Design a binder for this molecule. Structure first.
Ligand code: GTP
Ligand code: SPV
Ligand code: MN
Ligand code: MN
Ligand code: NA
Length: 613
């Protein structure tokens, strides 16, 4: 016998599946962490519908989720108000050298990542994980990021003590036995998560939502291929496939292996002639990726189909096409502001088999939030996400501003037919953008690849003041941002690369009274039409210091005669002088010695073009 007692064999505690079925290295990961965390039960997830039903029943019976009786198999979770978002301040990457993770900021305060030494992390880990799952179930989630068996896909194993995480990972990833079978004895990303509330509880449970805010820590150890997250049950902190794996770990793998992992939606757009192109777009959180990805275009004869709304993995193929896959299996979308007006296709997707977090509940068992733009019958009342009765005049919102739906992608009425194609879809344009209330026009086109990478690098967006969010990746870089820029720039030297056209948009320009100048949403189809024609080489552009913009009369504005074209499309020398001044200060402070020469040159070129105004 291979042990003197019972070794580290946790077979007696298995209530779903079999440890003997697991690949050897998967079993080692499970049993080592069972020894450390001391769960009462081990559940090896199979991904089946039967399992899912029982899981939802268990949570319902425990009071963790409530059934939304108005819809088909939809559910509501309300969280502790201390645990409502992905939390940057508690998110770290561990490497031997700090500079490999983040450039060293001249000011002593980096905006581009948060490094922790190996030594500090081991102390943090030992103060958190030993015994952390006592009295709970450790679920073993075998999951694939990307279509099962795609050459671009990567497998992880997430251990969690949260059945909410299991349910949500079933929606947001491909998970279950088929993944273990595809994995065999291959490599996998090791993902460990605990809510950090072992039984018996040391502190009061709030809203039946286990979390440990004081000890919350979301850590990434790329040199060990591990993600280790403690204390939050929410979104990007707990669903470890999404941001932690498919952006932070994957972006570093991508840099080493020649591909890209990005905070980008992917859509397919077809014109009235039946010609189709795929585009990717990087906008920061809260800047409308999900609305664009699922757009219902207002222009007649156009169609938009959704490949993904949040994450893109992209790699040049043998023919030079930049191919993109969506590594996710669902949409984890912001609920407030979602309406028939702003996202009709989301409304259709989320009425069955969807989990809602921190939205309001109507007395007939439906969902509600700010911006839903659907009146309720007189007499129908609303319970806020704080589990209190609520009325529209109340000071606070009925839904948390970061409340979410979690919905299967296959349910989207406009899901693209190649959304699971293993080879990915060929990207012909990349769009950058965010919230700029002044100075930045509706749409411009970069002059070259290098200018385009600079445009991504210089991105800024209003969220508690205008802040830099390069490539929409500020919270997500897996490694030094200067080296990420060098990696993007290097794509130009790939022989026979078919480099996408790069554009920058601004849906959010305001006039002097604070009013949006552009109606947006489905009307953004008019901007996509312009991009499409530009990729086709149409002579529809005017050169400006910032890049190309639409010629007068180039955009279809039929139906929008009240648009202030002068102000929306205006470029001010003084605004742009200040903009280059600010970008210079930011790059010098935050990137400094790690800034590639080509980014410095593009900054100088932009400065020089502005000088000629
Ligand atoms: N004015 C205007 N607002 C828009 C447009 N598109 C989206 N929005 C606003 O963008 C917000 C919704 O975007 P989110 O779903 O939070 O953004 P996201 O990029 O999907 O964010 P994550 O899922 O967190 O990555 C709401 O405030 C919308 O009103 C548009 O065309 N015009
Ligand atoms: O913050 C984002 O960009 C999100 O998509 C939500 S979360 O997955 O980070 O929670
Ligand atoms: Mn989104
Ligand atoms: Mn996102
Ligand atoms: Na709750």
């Amino acid at each position: 016998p291979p042990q003197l007692h019972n070794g580290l064999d946790f077979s007696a505690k298995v209530i779903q599946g079999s440890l003997d079925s697991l690949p050897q290295e998967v079993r080692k990961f499970v049993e080592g962490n069972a020894q450390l965390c001391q769960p009462e039960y081990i559940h090896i997830c199979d991904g089946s519908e039967e399992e899912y039903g029982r899981l939802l029943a268990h949570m319902q019976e425990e009071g963790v989720i409530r059934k939304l009786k108005k819809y088909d198999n939809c559910w509501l979770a309300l969280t502790d108000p201390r645990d409502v978002a992905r939390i940057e301040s508690k998110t770290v990457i561990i490497t031997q050298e700090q500079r490999d993770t983040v450039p060293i900021p001249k000011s002593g305060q980096s905006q581009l990542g948060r490094w922790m030494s190996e030594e500090d992390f081991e102390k943090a880990f030992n103060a958190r994980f030993p015994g952390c799952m006592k009295g709970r179930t450790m679920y073993v989630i075998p999951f694939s990021m990307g279509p099962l068996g795609s050459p671009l896909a990567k497998i992880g194993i997430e251990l969690t003590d949260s059945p909410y995480v299991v349910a949500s990972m079933r929606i947001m990833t491909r998970m279950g036995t088929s993944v273990l079978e595809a994995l065999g004895d291959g490599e996998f990303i090791k993902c460990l998560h605990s809510v950090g509330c072992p039984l018996p509880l040391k502190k009061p449970l709030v809203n039946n939502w286990a979390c440990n805010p004081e000890l919350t820590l979301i850590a990434h150890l790329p040199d060990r291929r591990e993600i280790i997250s403690f204390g939050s049950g929410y979104g990007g902190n707990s669903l470890l496939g999404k941001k932690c794996f498919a952006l932070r770990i994957a972006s570093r793998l991508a840099k080493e292996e020649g591909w890209l992992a990005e905070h980008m939606l992917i859509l397919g757009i077809t014109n009235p002639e039946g010609k189709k192109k795929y585009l990717a777009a990087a906008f920061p959180s809260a800047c409308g990726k999900t609305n664009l990805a699922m757009m219902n275009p207002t222009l007649p004869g156009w169609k938009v189909e959704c490949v993904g709304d949040d994450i893109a993995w992209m790699k040049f193929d043998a023919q030079g096409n930049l191919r993109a896959i969506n590594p996710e299996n669902g949409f984890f979308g912001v609920a407030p502001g979602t309406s028939v007006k702003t996202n009709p296709n989301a409304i259709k997707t989320i009425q069955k088999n969807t989990i809602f977090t921190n939205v309001a509940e109507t007395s007939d068992g439906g969902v509600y939030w700010e911006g839903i733009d659907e009146p309720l019958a007189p007499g129908v009342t609303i319970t806020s996400w704080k589990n209190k009765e609520w009325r529209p005049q109340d000071e606070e919102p009925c839904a948390h501003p970061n409340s979410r739906f979690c919905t299967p992608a296959s349910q989207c009425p406009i899901i693209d037919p190649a959304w699971e194609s293993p080879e990915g879809v060929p990207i012909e344009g990349i769009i950058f953008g965010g919230r700029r209330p002044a100075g930045v026009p509706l749409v411009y086109e970069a002059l070259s690849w290098q200018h385009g990478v600079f445009v991504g690098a210089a991105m800024r967006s209003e969220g508690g003041g205008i802040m830099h969010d390069p490539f929409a990746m500020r919270p997500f870089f897996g490694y030094n941002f200067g080296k990420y820029l060098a990696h993007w720039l290097s794509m130009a030297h790939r022989p026979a690369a078919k480099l996408p056209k790069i554009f920058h948009v601004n849906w959010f320009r305001k006039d002097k009274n604070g009013k949006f100048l552009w109606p947006g949403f489905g009307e953004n189809s008019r901007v996509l039409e312009w991009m499409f024609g530009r990729i086709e080489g149409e002579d529809s552009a005017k050169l400006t210091p910032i890049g190309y913009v639409p010629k007068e009369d180039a955009l279809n504005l039929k139906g929008l005669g009240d648009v202030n074209v002068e102000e929306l499309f205006g470029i001010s020398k003084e605004f742009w002088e200040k903009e280059v001044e600010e970008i210079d200060k930011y790059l010098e402070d935050q990137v400094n010695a790690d800034l590639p020469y080509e980014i410095e040159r593009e900054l100088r070129a932009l400065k020089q073009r502005i000088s000629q105004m």
